[PDB]
Amino acid sequence: FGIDMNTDYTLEEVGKQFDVTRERIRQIEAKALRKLRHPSRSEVLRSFLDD
């Protein structure tokens, strides 16, 4: 994503920065979003959603 950084790169650029292939990057980001979806990591973000 574009968080605290310049242009958000695609999967291949993230892989070249991590020397890993794109599918590992997708698995890692999905892992992190799963980890963030539960409360204790979601209560504070979710209050930003008035929907």
Partner: protein, 73 residues
């Protein structure tokens, strides 16, 4: 109490932990806090690691082992 009435994937521990919970029918924290060291230890493929991480996480939430339930549901 709200802490004992949440899912087993509530406190976000090891995947082996949740697998063993569903393998001993553990799905709610209400009786998960009902289980003591031996009762939890008896299970398959749940050795020191998973139960002791349960211990650490509930200690961070402060609760203890084997609390005797009434008003459940």
């Amino acid at each position: 109490d709200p802490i004992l009435l949440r899912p087993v994937d509530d406190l976000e521990l090891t995947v082996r932990s949740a697998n063993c919970l569903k393998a001993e029918a553990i799905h709610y924290i209400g009786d998960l806090v009902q289980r003591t060291e031996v009762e939890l230890l008896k299970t398959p493929n749940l050795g020191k690691k998973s139960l002791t991480e349960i211990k650490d996480v509930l200690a961070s939430r402060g609760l203890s082992l084997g609390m005797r339930l009434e008003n459940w549901p």
